[PDB]
Design an enzyme around this catalytic site. Structure first.
Site, short mmCIF file in Angstrom:
data_model
loop_
_atom_site.label_atom_id
_atom_site.label_comp_id
_atom_site.label_asym_id
_atom_site.label_seq_id
_atom_site.Cartn_x
_atom_site.Cartn_y
_atom_site.Cartn_z
N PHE A 182 25.01 11.11 -24.52
CA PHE A 182 25.27 11.29 -23.10
C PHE A 182 26.77 11.30 -23.01
CE2 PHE A 182 26.12 7.63 -20.12
CZ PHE A 182 26.51 8.33 -19.06
N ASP B 253 40.14 5.81 -37.95
CA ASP B 253 39.79 7.16 -37.50
C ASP B 253 41.02 8.00 -37.11
OD1 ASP B 253 37.66 9.03 -36.91
OD2 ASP B 253 37.65 8.35 -34.86
N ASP B 254 41.91 7.39 -36.36
CA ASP B 254 43.21 8.00 -35.95
C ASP B 254 44.06 8.35 -37.14
OD1 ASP B 254 42.13 7.40 -33.45
OD2 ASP B 254 43.64 6.06 -32.83
N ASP C 113 31.92 14.11 -22.53
CA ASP C 113 33.35 14.13 -22.92
C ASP C 113 33.86 15.50 -23.41
OD1 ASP C 113 33.49 11.38 -22.16
OD2 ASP C 113 33.33 10.75 -24.30
N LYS D 44 25.46 11.15 -38.22
CA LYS D 44 25.07 10.25 -39.28
C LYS D 44 24.18 9.10 -38.75
N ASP E 63 37.18 17.23 -21.96
CA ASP E 63 38.30 17.59 -22.89
C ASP E 63 38.50 19.04 -23.09
OD1 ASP E 63 38.42 15.04 -23.46
OD2 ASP E 63 37.55 15.24 -25.54
N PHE F 249 37.97 0.26 -36.91
CA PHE F 249 37.32 1.52 -37.17
C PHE F 249 38.10 2.70 -36.45
CE2 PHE F 249 34.47 4.75 -35.50
CZ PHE F 249 33.88 5.19 -36.67
N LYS G 203 36.31 1.83 -24.41
CA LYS G 203 35.82 3.15 -24.66
C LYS G 203 34.94 3.30 -25.90
CE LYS G 203 36.74 7.91 -25.37
NZ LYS G 203 37.70 9.00 -25.14
N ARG H 47 31.50 20.28 -32.00
CA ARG H 47 31.09 18.90 -32.10
C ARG H 47 30.06 18.83 -33.22
NH1 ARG H 47 32.22 14.03 -30.81
NH2 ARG H 47 32.86 14.60 -28.70
N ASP I 118 41.46 6.09 -20.53
CA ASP I 118 41.96 7.09 -21.47
C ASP I 118 42.51 8.28 -20.71
OD1 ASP I 118 42.53 8.02 -24.15
OD2 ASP I 118 40.58 8.88 -24.33
#
Ligand SMILES: Cc1ccc(-c2cc3c(N[C@@H](Cc4cccc(F)c4)P(=O)(O)O)ncnc3s2)cc1
Ligand SMILES: Cc1ccc(-c2cc3c(N[C@@H](Cc4cccc(F)c4)P(=O)(O)O)ncnc3s2)cc1
Ligand SMILES: Cc1ccc(-c2cc3c(N[C@@H](Cc4cccc(F)c4)P(=O)(O)O)ncnc3s2)cc1
Ligand SMILES: Cc1ccc(-c2cc3c(N[C@@H](Cc4cccc(F)c4)P(=O)(O)O)ncnc3s2)cc1
Ligand SMILES: Cc1ccc(-c2cc3c(N[C@@H](Cc4cccc(F)c4)P(=O)(O)O)ncnc3s2)cc1
Ligand SMILES: Cc1ccc(-c2cc3c(N[C@@H](Cc4cccc(F)c4)P(=O)(O)O)ncnc3s2)cc1
Lengths: 341, 341
Positions: B91, B234-235, B96, B50, B100, B230, B191, B105, B167
């Site tokens: 980047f 999101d969580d 990430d 977005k 992970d 934010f 982060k 994505r 993290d």
């Protein structure tokens, strides 16, 4: 000589480099754990080499700068920027070892190979990169050459990366039609010579007030040539070096590398001999690797190298004659000795 | 509104961003192949989002700068720096996803997952990083805010990385004693909030001549709070969001994340309820994940969130009242609307 003279004070400086990078503040408690990881990373990956690149920063600053202006603080900035070079190197190696699937590095398990690390070494490599700029801020933000050095390091990163891309494209697939001389020269210049040879000398120059584009271009012309030779000699010694003298046991041929040896072989080989190589280039099986060694000897490459080495020394000496001015030619000669030796 | 108004000209700019980054010179033939790879990388990873972060640069520059001084070239620098923000993001995400082991994505196979790429995405991520600085050189080297922006981006990288380390340390091992609120706040700030909220506004500020440390600190105070909210929202939505509205289907609980939900659960749960979670936190098996969802509902967390959301809006409005000056409060309000919405 001039480098064993600087080495104690340069390796002692590392401790301070870590103190200030890992200087955990009483107003930032909860990153401590992360900073602890950072220290581990620095200690494992920035140490254990010969430190030639970073030392070259320090030696060049001592030849470039009136001794009247080599105060403690200036010296300390020199050691710091030499450490920044070693940190740039460390960032590239931690990351290249992951990419190549390498096992060891400097006779030590590669960092990504340690249990508990893995692909987390991706971020660790990125922190090594960031440390460069933290250090330049801390030690150099008030200097007039500050922005010059930021741009230098950034450019050096970009060149090496772009070289690394070309290297990766060039060996996906045994396709030896990819292994042109043009292509080999271009991988070496981008991937290893800019950061290994240009960067340390350029850094010292900027530290000494020498910031001209022609000056820099003249130094670059000499240093990129040196860098090409160094890597060529490295490819050679990977196979014909004595592991005692080199301290590396070489696997270039197993790893299907775009090595100088492979490149020459293919310029020289009859269509028949193409085929023997096309066969043994990459198998683990030792009689595979041994039959390329023996082809390399049968193509008189060890002598091709020796002719290339003399050719190269003559050219370097002409470059130095023409382009060193107004730097002391010793700056270049001291390096030449480190690698034609 | 103010963001759909900028979006066409900002996405059109990307083409030019690629022209100049991939501008292969007639004196550098043999990197072409590598530059071709670079273009592929940019096109795959810098597009499809977005563009909120990069757009915020552009919107803020339009509110900050006298319209008399929003010439074509200034605007173009704004779009470019907004693109730099998107490239920083790209980047971090390419890197990430590798770390992970992510699969997709933005509903697209992660770049490292494409056949032919793999761990080579490590270098591709590093090139994305470098592009930032190439762009700032090209478009901004003559501006007085140049060094300010280099240092900004570099700092933003360092913070995000250091956050990423924390993290990673925090979720090696289900050990939920690691999942303190203090720790959650600290991961979020480093982060995600510095680069997601501070960076774009700070960049615009520097572009507009606003370079004061108090100014910047005041904007930071507001923006780090926004960034915390934010991520909390999101969580929350990862579990209770509608995938239709969110466009993400959430796996936080399978991936044993340090999510705001998990943190609250553990502040609130009897020793008995500790155990049910300690059981179902991470299994793939859907009745595992469903039995934490149902515990979250039984702990009234969706309402805890709703109280947190109102609390947060009140606080943000007080921060804006106190610390916006002398920026137009609209700069902040426009963002608040984008995320309390
Ligand atoms: C052992 C030793 C080392 C360095 C020197 C000198 C350096 C130098 C010198 N170098 C200057 C930097 C410089 C500029 C242009 C070309 C150079 F090689 C060095 P400074 O930063 O002012 O020290 N300029 C004028 N005279 C001298 S004598 C003299 C003896
Ligand atoms: C700028 C710069 C300067 C020096 C070097 C290197 C020198 C060197 C090195 N030098 C040694 C000799 C040498 C050079 C090249 C290959 C060898 F195997 C041994 P020395 O002359 O005893 O210091 N040995 C192994 N690796 C390296 S890397 C790399 C970059
Ligand atoms: C500036 C400078 C450059 C090179 C040298 C020397 C290199 C060298 C030398 N180097 C190499 C061999 C060699 C052969 C032909 C031409 C060369 F330049 C080097 P090596 O010992 O195999 O690493 N061998 C014997 N004597 C010398 S003197 C000394 C000073
Ligand atoms: C739509 C619109 C957008 C911006 C503005 C104004 C910006 C501005 C202004 N901003 C300046 C930057 C600035 C400095 C301090 C605080 C700010 F909010 C902005 P400039 O870079 O000189 O344009 N300074 C004085 N008057 C105005 S009026 C007026 C109308
Ligand atoms: C600086 C800055 C500004 C905006 C954002 C984001 C907004 C947003 C977003 N905003 C939308 C509403 C929204 C906000 C948060 C979560 C949502 F699911 C939906 P909209 O108000 O329609 O633009 N939706 C999904 N992801 C993001 S990231 C991120 C950083
Ligand atoms: C600057 C600014 C900030 C927030 C808003 C509004 C948010 C909002 C709103 N937002 C959210 C719900 C909400 C509930 C309680 C307090 C809130 F701040 C928001 P959602 O629709 O669930 O994303 N819901 C209904 N009306 C409004 S008006 C409008 C302008």
């Amino acid at each position: 000589d001039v480098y064993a003279q600087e080495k104690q004070d340069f390796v002692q400086h590392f401790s301070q480099i870590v103190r200030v990078l890992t200087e955990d503040e009483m107003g930032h408690p909860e990153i401590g754990d992360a900073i602890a990881r950072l220290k581990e990373v620095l200690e494992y990956n920035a140490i254990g080499g010969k430190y030639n690149r970073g030392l070259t920063v320090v030696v060049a600053f001592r030849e470039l700068v009136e001794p009247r202006k080599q105060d403690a603080d200036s010296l300390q900035r020199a050691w710091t920027v030499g450490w920044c070079v070693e940190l740039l190197q460390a960032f590239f190696l931690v990351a290249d070892d992951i990419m190549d699937s390498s096992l060891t590095r400097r006779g030590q398990i590669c960092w990504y190979q340690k249990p508990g690390v893995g692909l987390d070494a991706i971020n660790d490599a990125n922190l090594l990169e960031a440390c460069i700029y933290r250090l330049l801020k801390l030690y150099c933000r008030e200097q007039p050459y500050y922005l010059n050095l930021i741009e230098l390091f950034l450019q050096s990163s970009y060149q090496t990366e772009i070289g690394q891309t070309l290297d990766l494209l060039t060996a996906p697939n045994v396709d030896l039609v990819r292994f042109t001389e043009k292509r080999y020269k271009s991988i070496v210049k981008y991937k290893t010579a800019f950061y290994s040879f240009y960067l340390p000398i350029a850094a010292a120059m900027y530290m000494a007030g020498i910031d001209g584009e022609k000056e820099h271009a003249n130094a670059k012309k000499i240093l990129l040539e040196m860098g090409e030779f160094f890597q060529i000699q490295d490819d050679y010694l990977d196979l014909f070096g004595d592991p005692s003298v080199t301290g590396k046991i070489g696997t270039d041929i197993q790893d299907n590398k775009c090595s100088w040896l492979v490149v020459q072989c293919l310029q020289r080989a009859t269509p028949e001999q193409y085929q023997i190589l096309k066969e043994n280039y990459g198998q683990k099986e030792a009689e595979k690797v041994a039959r390329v060694k023996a082809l390399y000897e049968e193509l008189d490459l060890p002598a091709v190298f020796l002719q290339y080495e003399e050719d190269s020394y003559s050219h370097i000496m002409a470059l130095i004659e023409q382009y060193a001015a107004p730097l002391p030619p010793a700056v270049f000669l001291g390096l030449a000795r480190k690698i034609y030796k």
